């Protein structure tokens, strides 16, 4: 339960965010360590970033949207999470065994979500308990908790949830399902209305420590401190941009 662990000297504050709450379920070398568990096991992204990023588009490509904004529960065949226009599935509860590394969620600012049983109480088993789970269920904040989450699964692929995104309408089958700010293609698809993950705009994702892991081809990116407002609350946060 409570590691009381004797004493520590300096001026103190609270209990904070624990590491044991990280699901290290990683089936490519298991681990000799923890940094070991994540690199020499799973994320083997070497240099294919030019042609991985090839399958993504500028926002200009997509069909202009008519009329009123709706929400899409389709998410189908859209399977390139490193592109800004990935239309993700709304967040469910994902069992701890399918996660390698920490899970980050975005009230646009990033926060860690830890392992827990199906009744919401934190578990500190490094997610190796079977009943451990990552309860990611989301609702768009000013009221819910976050616009979306990104994490890495047991074979090291990045996978994201959030939203659900917006059906801004469109002319043809070459049409956009907006997971971010879009007021280019439709003048009401802002991040607060359609943002479904870290992607602040088509070309800026929220900087966070495992941004280099989950979205690896944004290494070369430039980091900016930007304000944002989410139903009244001020968010100041770094964005990796290009």
């Amino acid at each position, epitope marked *: 339960s409570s590691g009381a662990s004797q004493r520590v000297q300096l001026i103190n504050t609270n209990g904070s965010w624990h590491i044991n709450r990280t699901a290290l379920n990683c089936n490519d070398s298991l681990h000799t360590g923890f940094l070991a568990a994540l690199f020499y096991t799973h994320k083997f992204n070497a240099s294919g970033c030019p042609e991985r990023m090839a399958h993504c588009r500028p926002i200009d490509e997509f069909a202009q949207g008519w009329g009123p904004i709706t*929400y899409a529960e389709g998410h189908g065949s859209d399977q390139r999470p490193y592109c800004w226009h990935y239309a993700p599935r709304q967040c469910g509860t994902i069992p701890a065994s399918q996660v390698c590394g920490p899970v980050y969620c975005f009230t646009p600012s990033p926060v860690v979500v830890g392992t827990t049983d199906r009744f*919401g109480a*934190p578990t500190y088993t490094w997610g190796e308990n079977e009943t451990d789970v990552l309860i990611l*269920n989301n*609702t768009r904040p000013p*009221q819910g*908790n976050w616009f979306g989450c990104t994490w890495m699964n047991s074979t090291g692929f990045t996978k994201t949830c959030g939203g659900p995104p917006c059906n801004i309408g469109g002319v043809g089958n070459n049409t956009l399902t907006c997971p971010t700010d879009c007021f280019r293609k439709h003048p009401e698809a802002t991040y607060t209305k359609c943002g479904s993950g870290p992607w602040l705009t088509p070309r800026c994702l929220v900087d966070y420590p495992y941004r280099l892991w989950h979205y690896p081809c944004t290494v070369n990116f430039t980091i900016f401190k930007v304000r944002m407002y989410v139903g009244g*609350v001020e968010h100041r946060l770094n964005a990796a941009c290009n």
Partner: antibody, heavy 124, light 108 residues
Framework: QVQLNQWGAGLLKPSETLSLTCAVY????????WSWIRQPPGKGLQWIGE???????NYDPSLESRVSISLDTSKNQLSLKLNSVTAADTALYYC??????????????????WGQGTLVTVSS | AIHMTQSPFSLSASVGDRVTITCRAS??????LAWYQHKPGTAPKVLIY???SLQDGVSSRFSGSGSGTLFTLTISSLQPEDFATYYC?????????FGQGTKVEMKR
């Protein structure tokens, strides 16, 4: 979409103490508040009380005398307890997660995540 | 204690109508108001918070307006799923106080 979970014994006889718990999924974050609501049969929704990110609470002046709400952050569990219960406390008891933010002057509250209810029949 | 009085307590409407329930505050509650939808068997849903904002994925039919002492929920065209009971609720005062609810039945 986020839905909460309520536990607790629902049948009471008068002068016992009703004691529900409610798994608000998710850690306490700044501005978050949690509250309990009851629907006595045939009546409207009725406010019991709130506890927020700070641990301090508004109750209903009717029930302050004998009610209490805590939040055990260790298990992410909300708690409601009604003392000296009367047969009139029979109702359907809801627990709700919500967010209250102040843009300087004005503020808004709202409850976006809810329990399932627990019917509590108090009757001898 | 800020008393909210909600109008009308009952209301019969067809599918297609505009429906405007309202809710008046004894004193000014700024615009800390909130609108909830209650159907027998289910928990309540927030539809509108801050008296005029739409909760994520609550339909465009639902317009919230007003401020001070006088607030409306307005449904654009009534939909079969919309038939429920609606309660307002202010979040400005020491005792949170509801409206009495408006039960919106279907006409036949």
């Amino acid at each position: 979409q986020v839905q909460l979970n309520q536990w607790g014994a629902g049948l009471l006889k008068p002068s016992e103490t009703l004691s529900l718990t409610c798994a608000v999924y998710g850690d306490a974050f700044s501005g978050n508040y949690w509250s309990w609501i009851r629907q006595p049969p045939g009546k409207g929704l009725q406010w019991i009380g709130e506890i927020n990110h700070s641990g301090n609470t508004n109750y209903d002046p009717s029930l302050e005398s004998r009610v209490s709400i805590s939040l055990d952050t260790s298990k992410n569990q909300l708690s409601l307890k009604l003392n000296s219960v009367t047969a009139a406390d029979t109702a359907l008891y809801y627990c709700a997660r919500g967010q209250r933010n102040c843009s300087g002057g004005n503020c808004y509250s709202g409850l976006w995540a809810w329990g399932q209810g627990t019917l509590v029949t108090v009757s001898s | 204690a800020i008393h909210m009085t909600q109008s009308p307590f009952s209301l019969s409407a067809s599918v297609g109508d505009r429906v405007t329930i309202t809710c008046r505050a004894s004193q000014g509650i700024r615009n800390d108001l909130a609108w909830y939808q209650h159907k027998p068997g289910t928990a309540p849903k927030v539809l509108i918070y801050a008296a005029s904002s739409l909760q994520d994925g609550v339909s465009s039919r639902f317009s919230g307006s007003g401020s001070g002492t006088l607030f409306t929920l307005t449904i654009s065209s009534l939909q079969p799923e919309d038939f429920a009971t609606y309660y307002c609720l202010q979040g400005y005062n020491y005792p949170r106080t509801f409206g009495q609810g408006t039960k919106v039945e279907m006409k036949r």
